[PDB]
Design a protein around this nucleic acid. Structure first.
Ligand SMILES: [Cl-]
Ligand SMILES: [Cl-]
Ligand SMILES: [Mg+2]
Ligand SMILES: [Mg+2]
Ligand SMILES: [Mg+2]
Ligand SMILES: [Mg+2]
Ligand SMILES: [Mg+2]
Ligand SMILES: [Mg+2]
Ligand SMILES: [Mg+2]
Ligand SMILES: [Mg+2]
Ligand SMILES: [Mg+2]
Ligand code: NA
Ligand code: NA
Ligand code: NA
Ligand code: NA
Ligand code: NA
Ligand code: NA
Lengths: 186, 156, 95, 140, 154
RNA sequence: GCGGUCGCACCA
RNA sequence: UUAGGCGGCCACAGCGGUGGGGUUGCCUCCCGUACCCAUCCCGAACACGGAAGAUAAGCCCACCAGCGUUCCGGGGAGUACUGGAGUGCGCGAGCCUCUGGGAAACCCGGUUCGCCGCCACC
RNA sequence: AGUGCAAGAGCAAAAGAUAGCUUGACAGUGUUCUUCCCAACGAGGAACGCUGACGCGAAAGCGUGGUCUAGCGAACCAAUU
RNA sequence: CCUGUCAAACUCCAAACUUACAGACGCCGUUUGACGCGGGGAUUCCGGUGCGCGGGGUA
């Protein structure tokens, strides 16, 4: 920018999107990466491999195409994340993928976070991933219990119209249950 | 000491003051002479061109310039002309003043490296080439044979 | 030379041009080679590890197995056969 | 367009640059939340050679905590103009600084895809005076 | 296709230059060889440029020299039309010459020594201290220029 | 190594 | 790719600036703190929960060359330098000829305001 | 800028700063390069492994002292494990 | 802004050229066995000059 000698960061570093130091450490395993990404409204999970001209995604799942299986709830929460992980994990298995390492990009490794929920899901789908059980949420919060109880302090529906008034961690089970057998795209 | 000892450009360029200390000051008094207030807005422009690459000690530079400018007072202390010596003595020169043991010399002076065909002096004058004479006297005190060249001046 | 350390006279070869300055891309540090492949040796000024003795910068050897993540490249120094332990970060496929 | 262009207060920093404290106490009451130590850098003649060393405290207030404070701070100040930032900030006073900016500031403070706020979307000294002056007082 | 003739001796000539002449089958002064005009061959002759005389000869000249100084891979045998016909793919010297010139074959390919051991130039050459453009005899020559040399060394 | 800068001792 | 995620090359992509775009696939800003989690002080950030509002930031789309960069034409320049050769010149420093290579600055005019891969998606 | 110390080199979501924790400055044994270009030569040095035991981290992973190139010493004898 | 100069321990640039590997031609080797391996025997470790490139030195 200033002159011939000026050093311009790699594009993905300018865009503040890729942490290249972590990326290298990630690639060391030589295994596929379980890319755990979030959005204000959604949660994405991809299984990426290395390629000659860039990464190759062999399997993915987005919190939106969750409804395609009977999801009638918001998609930016814990139960959502888990399921998207499990969904991607299964598609992953179908693709012949057996193991992967968790890439949480620029997110923070906070215990019980959604990325770890995504990781839990993928593991349960059958994917072998280096992990640590007590950094994950306690199942109930994954089910979405923390939100149901939060609606107990109601007075006004936590959900604007949406589905239910007191919400459903049960809807969670019905879905997980569904994903664990048959059905299309899995 | 004789020019014979330093006029050739056979040694490496030695000018890094960060590694050389005790360098004698230059005897060259000024580089811009005459009406330096004015810019080259003159009709005629003569130059003294060196015809062989050589090294010119600050000694010869001063004597060459003095003899030329001191003469350009055929025009007056505040005459209408500007004189410029464009070269500076960057090359540091030594002398091994023990015999040939540990002979790297000690700094004794400085010189300017001029390549054949460069102009060492440039004067700016109105039709009144007294400067042509100031130079017959200047190239008299520098090692090389020289060419007195006139540029803007088809007023022959 | 006034000294005989490995980095003697390496100012040029182990320095980056100002624009290639800074952490290098991971893609080439993870490249995988096969035994028999020809690879050009060139230290990457930005990558501290996996290096080889500067004297071999420019050699083109043959990958013949690996040690840990580092590769074992066979080269010929003058007329002598030598084996060099080097990481991908400092290797490139010939052709 | 507007609504997302109209100024707002983002943090008010009240700090007492002492030279070595007991002062936190008053800051806690004047604001309503714990103060933070102020270590110093460089060794210097004011017998302040200690690098890591408590030499003052500060308090960053946000939201109501910041208004409820300014609703008494401002009144204790008169100044305006020249004493304003080129970014629409201003410090008066014990110091009390007010950082002002518009709605999409998080873009420059988050971790992911962060970005620097465009000069156009920045807050000018003027656009600042207006907002505040338009909130219980007068400019210059 | 160019005719190469070494005009300067080995003493004091760079070794990598001497080896080049040797790869071009010339090991003595006045020895000549025929070389195809290829990138590879071109680089070699350029390296040997200062100790040789070279150029594209005329059909006739080649024929005179071939007849006068060509030899079998082994032996004294004179290479005349009959030899040529009874030993090569061509029917006479002219046919061989043309083939060489059009770089279709080589002296070896036809059972002939790659070297035409010429005779010193009758009347002497133009000197080995200057190139053709300076009146000497070194370097690239005219077809007329090569011919004269080759003919005087017939 | 031992003794008060010094003295003693000491085949790596 | 009517706005996404992971990348490869790592300024041809930087710096600066103009215009356009969203009842929704969307991304954002945004709203909010019971929870997981969090600030040596602040739900600012991090984390979690969410949609009343917005397209003003960001982002995506179209474009501008003033600066920086890449490549090209013409000029500089077959100049500077140089591998090989010489009973060529020069008191000498050094130069010249033949042969094989061949620049930098700078000026003028174009180019460049990224390209490409995998996945997902009215 | 900083990174203990020459000089040159490396480094920015770090190789720097701050905080916290930890003792891998670990035992054993090698491969290779260096010392000594080519091209034989010891001590020493480094790079990269493995076996064992550990530290930290969600994890990939990092840690074979200090970002790299100086800071080193045979046989005999003694003391020590 | 304009204007005057430099660098063995400067570099936004940048040759000729030297060099690793590979293919092609050439040359060479398969009875003259190359390339290479193992063994016996040395001499040698005062060098000099021309040319190109040098560093020191008035030379
Ligand atoms: Cl994310
Ligand atoms: Cl090595
Ligand atoms: Mg150098
Ligand atoms: Mg014969
Ligand atoms: Mg006669
Ligand atoms: Mg003669
Ligand atoms: Mg002894
Ligand atoms: Mg807009
Ligand atoms: Mg280290
Ligand atoms: Mg002991
Ligand atoms: Mg060299
Ligand atoms: Na002496
Ligand atoms: Na003279
Ligand atoms: Na780099
Ligand atoms: Na403290
Ligand atoms: Na917008
Ligand atoms: Na050793």
């Amino acid at each position: 920018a200033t002159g011939p000698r000026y050093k311009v960061p790699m594009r993905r570093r300018r865009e503040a999107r890729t942490d290249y130091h972590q990326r290298l450490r990630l690639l060391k395993s030589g295994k596929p990466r379980l890319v755990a990404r979030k959005s204000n409204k959604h949660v994405r999970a991809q299984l990426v491999t290395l390629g000659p001209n860039g990464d190759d995604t062999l399997a993915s799942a987005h919190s939106s195409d969750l409804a395609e299986y009977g999801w009638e709830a918001p998609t930016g929460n814990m139960p959502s994340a888990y399921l998207t992980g499990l969904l991607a994990g299964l598609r992953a298995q179908e693709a012949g993928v057996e193991e992967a390492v968790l890439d949480i990009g620029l997110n923070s490794p906070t215990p019980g976070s959604k990325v770890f929920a995504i990781q839990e899901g993928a593991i349960d789908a059958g994917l072998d991933i280096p992990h640590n059980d007590d950094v994950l949420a306690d199942w109930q919060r994954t089910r979405g219990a923390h939100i149901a109880e939060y609606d107990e302090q109601l007075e006004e529906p936590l959900y604007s119209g949406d589905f239910d008034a007191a919400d459903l961690p049960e809807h969670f089970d019905e879905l997980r249950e569904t994903l664990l057998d048959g059905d299309i795209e899995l | 000491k004789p020019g014979a000892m330093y006029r050739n450009s056979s040694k490496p360029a030695y000018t890094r003051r960060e590694y050389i200390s005790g360098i004698p000051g230059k005897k060259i008094a000024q580089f811009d002479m005459g009406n330096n207030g004015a810019g080259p807005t003159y009709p005629a422009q003569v130059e003294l061109v060196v015809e062989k690459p050589v090294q010119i000690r600050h000694n010869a530079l001063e004597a060459a310039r003095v003899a030329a400018n001191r003469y350009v007072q055929n025009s007056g202390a505040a005459a209408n002309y500007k004189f410029r010596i464009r070269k500076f003595p960057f090359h540091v020169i030594r002398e091994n003043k023990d015999g040939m043991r540990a002979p790297f010399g000690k700094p004794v002076g400085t010189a300017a490296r001029v390549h054949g065909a460069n102009h060492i002096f440039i004067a700016w004058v109105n039709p009144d080439p007294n400067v042509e004479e100031a130079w017959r006297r200047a190239k008299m005190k520098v090692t090389p044979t020289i060419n007195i060249d006139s540029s803007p001046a088809g007023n022959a | 030379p006034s000294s005989n350390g490995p980095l003697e006279g390496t100012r040029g070869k182990l320095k980056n041009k100002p624009r290639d300055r800074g952490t290098s891309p991971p893609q080439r540090a993870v490249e995988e080679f096969d035994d028999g492949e020809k690879v050009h040796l060139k230290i990457d000024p930005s990558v501290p590890n996996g290096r080889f003795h500067p004297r071999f910068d420019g050699q083109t050897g043959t990958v013949e197995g690996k040690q840990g993540d580092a590769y074992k490249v066979d080269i010929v120094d003058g007329g002598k056969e030598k084996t060099i332990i080097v990481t991908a970060a400092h290797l490139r496929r010939q052709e | 367009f507007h609504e997302m262009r109209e100024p707002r207060i983002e943090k008010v920093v009240v700090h007492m640059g002492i030279g070595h404290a007991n002062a936190e106490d008053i800051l806690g009451e004047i604001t309503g939340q714990m103060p933070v130590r102020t270590k110093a850098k460089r060794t210097v003649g004011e017998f302040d050679i200690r690098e890591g060393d408590p030499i003052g405290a500060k308090v960053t207030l946000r939201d109501e905590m910041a208004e409820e404070f300014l609703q008494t701070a401002l009144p204790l100040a008169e100044l305006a103009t020249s004493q304003f930032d080129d970014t629409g900030n201003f410090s008066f006073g014990l110091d009390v600084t007010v950082n002002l900016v518009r709605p999409g500031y998080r873009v420059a403070k988050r971790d992911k895809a962060s970005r620097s706020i465009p000069t156009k979307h920045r807050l000018n000294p003027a656009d600042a005076v207006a907002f505040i002056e338009s909130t219980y007082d007068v400019e210059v | 296709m160019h005719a190469l003739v070494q005009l300067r001796g080995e003493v004091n000539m760079h070794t990598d230059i001497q080896d080049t002449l040797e790869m071009l089958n010339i090991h003595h002064v006045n020895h000549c060889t025929l070389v195809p005009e290829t990138d590879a061959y071109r680089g070699m002759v350029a390296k040997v440029n200062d100790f040789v005389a070279f150029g594209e000869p005329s059909q006739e000249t080649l024929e005179t020299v071939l007849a006068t100084r060509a030899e079998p891979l082994e032996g004294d045998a004179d290479v005349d039309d009959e030899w040529v016909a009874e030993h090569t793919d061509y029917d006479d010297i002219s046919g061989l010459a043309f083939a060489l010139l059009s770089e279709e074959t080589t002296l070896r390919e036809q059972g002939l020594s790659p070297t035409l051991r010429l005779h010193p130039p009758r009347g002497g050459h133009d000197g080995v201290k200057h190139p053709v453009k300076e009146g000497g005899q070194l370097g690239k020559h005219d077809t007329e220029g090569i011919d004269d040399l080759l003919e005087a060394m017939r």
